Nucleic acid binder design. Structure first.
Length: 54
RNA sequence: AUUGAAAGUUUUUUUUUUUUUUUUUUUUUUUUUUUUUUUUUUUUUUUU
């Protein structure tokens, strides 16, 4: 908008996309992904709490 | 005390001059600082 020449009155980014301000989940190229580190940590926690001699 | 003698073979003269141990002669010709080595492992973006 011509360097926002003293208007600042259009919704612009609000309506251009469909993502409000929130806590973003980790995703790769618009594909939601569960981190491998998270899965490994969960598995290790389960194994430690389950295996007796851990 | 000889026939019987008293005389320096001496004075004087530079073995000196002319002549560069000199000219030419590159301590160089060759030799890859390479060569084996994964910036790797451990860690749940998360609670009253």
């Amino acid at each position: 908008d011509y360097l926002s020449g003293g208007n600042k009155r259009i919704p612009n980014n609000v309506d251009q996309y469909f993502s409000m301000v929130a806590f973003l989940m980790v995703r790769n190229k618009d594909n939601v992904v569960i981190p491998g580190s998270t899965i490994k940590g969960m598995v290790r926690s389960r194994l430690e709490l389950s295996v007796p001699g851990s």
